[PDB]
Write a protein that binds this ligand. Structure first.
Ligand code: CA
Length: 213
């Protein structure tokens, strides 16, 4: 059985965290696959390097160790939704972040609690590339359980996230997250009038999820 431990993010975790996020997203991500070509691995690592110090100092994120091997197998990166660093993105990834703000913004600022230390934003979750299905599912359940623990212990009101893959969407449902928006990603229109995910099937959703703590 996979034995795991959640450890607060440290400064020296940067390369291990970058490796997990790059592997977990690049090519794999359900939105960026429709922005091909022009998405590079460094687009993800550039964003993470730009926020790394603030990410560690806010003390809301963690890594997951396989206690048997003492190696990092997953990571959960979190911010206060109302206290997130201002990063400017060069790549086509900016379209992804603008779409997520399209989904999250109106709901966050008009229906969720006001003030700092209220909304815990689960903004990245990833697992190591070499995990088999059993280990991936176990790690996801573990991080989902620990994000809840951080939320209560840090006195947040709830957890807020947009889930863009079928597995993360279904996990959120069985963990009793409330669905606040179920958006068809091929209907999103960019500022230039194009639909950057327009080639996606009608069944690909972006789901805004909220769980009171
Ligand atoms: Ca297991």
């Amino acid at each position: 059985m996979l034995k795991m431990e959640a450890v607060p993010l440290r400064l020296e975790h940067r390369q291990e965290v970058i490796d997990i996020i790059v592997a977990s997203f690049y090519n794999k991500a359900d939105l960026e696959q429709w922005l091909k070509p022009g998405v590079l691995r460094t687009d993800y690592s550039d964003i993470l390097n730009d926020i790394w110090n603030v990410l560690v100092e806010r003390d809301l994120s963690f890594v997951v160790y396989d206690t048997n091997t003492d190696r990092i197998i997953g990571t959960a990166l979190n911010f206060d939704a109302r206290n997130e660093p201002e990063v400017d993105i060069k790549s086509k990834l900016l379209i992804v972040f603008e779409f997520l703000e399209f989904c999250e913004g109106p709901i966050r600022d008009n229906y969720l609690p006001k003030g700092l230390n209220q909304i815990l934003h689960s903004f990245m979750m990833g697992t190591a590339e070499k995990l088999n299905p059993r280990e991936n599912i176990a790690c996801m359940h573990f991080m989902e359980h620990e994000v809840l623990r951080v939320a209560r212990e840090k006195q947040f009101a709830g957890i807020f996230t947009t889930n863009t893959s079928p597995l993360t969407q279904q996990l959120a449902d069985v963990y009793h997250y409330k669905t606040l928006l179920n958006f068809q990603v091929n209907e999103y229109v960019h500022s230039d009038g194009s639909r950057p995910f327009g080639d996606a099937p009608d069944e690909q959703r972006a789901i805004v999820h909220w769980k009171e703590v």
